[model samples]
Target: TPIHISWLSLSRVNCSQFLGLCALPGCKFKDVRRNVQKDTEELKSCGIQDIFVFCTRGELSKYRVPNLLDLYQQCGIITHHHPIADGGTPDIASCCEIMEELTTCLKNYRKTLIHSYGGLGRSCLVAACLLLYLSDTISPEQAIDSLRDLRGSGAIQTIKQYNYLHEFRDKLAAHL
Candidate 1:
């Protein structure tokens, strides 16, 4: 099937939550901001139309980017994230406090084709999640493969990340 694709960066903090971010290990203030900016620019250049900022509420506010809030606001993308689909199944520190935007996405994200990237396993999760929610049109393998091809990053590179990737696939398969 043909899909009109636009790559939007899912802004999760990736393993940065473990750093010395207020004693949160892996939480690099600079790294998150840099990622946000880089992905923002990449998506913008690609003519994509969304940037879902995936981080703790605190991180989003503390993130140092000039006009960051203004631009994200202007973009009309859901600002933060969470999904009932997640259902507390498993927790990644990066997925911390991500409820608003994701729930919004589930409710409203309708498309014949869509693509996403940026931050941990979230890009694939969201794509698979959205597909399940919208139209059970793609199988789990297809979703994983589609995301890997779109980002050139397989859903499973290391064991740990595979948890969400696998869980995401399973839950999506069980969706309503």
Candidate 2:
């Protein structure tokens, strides 16, 4: 129950596409405590097919769920471990890779979830970048707004993350 998930339906861009943003499962932070086993069970029950984890192993251990990735796999969910620092942003190349993988999952109609330590910083940043990556019609501001609308004002927590979303298109183009 400590694992809070905010579902964003991006059906406007792609019907049947739903993305879940979540706080780390089994996390025992300063005040928050969650049960990993129960959380994974809940995720399985939700029919989550794919999961993208933005927390590093170090963070996982710190949060008391070092085997969270394995737990997800045990529940038959395909796991993508792309670790970004708690308040850091992924580089263009890494961001592009993550976006591409996420696109594949969505196109395949996979029920996907993305999470970070808090589900507000890195998780939301990638979600915003995905909006920009998937549609040229979606401006950076719009992408940020979309995530904020779904995840609240706390989404995209840092100024650096904000700038990353703004420059994502150009960086992706240059990378190509």
Candidate 3:
């Protein structure tokens, strides 16, 4: 198989998550965003059509990619911008909204990428939630473990985040 063909295969049932999905570490303005034009193209080539940006615009400004959303749009990649404070947890209501967005994107088969400053914290939290939401039999530990295996042990940064995952089901049940 050609590289692109093989790349497509690995995206399915691979360590990352679902088809055309990726969770990336934070991108620096000078080191990463400086190459946004080229990097965006590379992601597009990989069939990524949407991006879930967890970094606050303020956070990106500090690291410098204030224009990051625009840059992504210019590249023709749809972006889902939900700013979760660095090292912070989102309110349950907000989390549900974000999850709804993710569900729609996945259900529609959009190639997606998710990211935060370190990709070890907020990004991992959302990814874990998605894992649990997609599969009923998986435990919170299993969800976290899956992220750890794919994104390293640093996947869930705070104790608060770990606790949140454990309670996610109950909170979601209440919300429902």
Candidate 4:
């Protein structure tokens, strides 16, 4: 028996390119803070019913979106706060939990969004994890490549992050 999935056979997922997943940009870069309310309205307009947040309260505060999660909930969007520090990798167990919840949301047809300060660091890491969790045919390289195609070449920001993706499948193989 042989199992094969070509790159074209497997659909690619970009942040906002897929209906089930969206990677959003927010926060203060240098001195500009995004309008939380506008971002919320736009997501809701695009039918986003849930969001995964990977930024800490401090990052949220630093970026000046301290009440962003609260605002999303207030606007009837379900918010999940599984804060991972910027450029930091979460424990595999924690990622498994988030991926479980993400799977549930997607299975139930909840349009979902995931975000970080710039939507390229921790956010991309979680997104890549979810991509791998969704399908066995999707390789770590493919997952990262798809994200980079969606965002920029810098989708996975740190070496630690890059290594995490490459190591994920091996670690998961052991854990499984």
Q: Evaluate all candidate structures by whole-model CA lDDT and list the values in order.
A: 0.38, 0.86, 0.71, 0.72
| TM-score on alpha carbons, each prediction | 0.43, 0.95, 0.82, 0.82
Which pairs of residues collide in model 3?
none
Query: How far is 2's C-alpha from truth in model 2 (Å)?
Result: 6.2
List, residue by residue over 66-113, the lDDT tens digit for candidate 3.
787887888788988888877777788888888888878766877777
TM-score of 2: 0.95
| Residue lDDT tens for model 4, 42-114 | 6777677888888888877877778878888988999998988789988888888898988787668676777
Candidate No. with top TM-score? 2
Candidate 2 ranges beyond 4 A from true positions: none
Among the numbered candidates, top lDDT falls to 2
| Order of quality (lDDT) | 2, 4, 3, 1
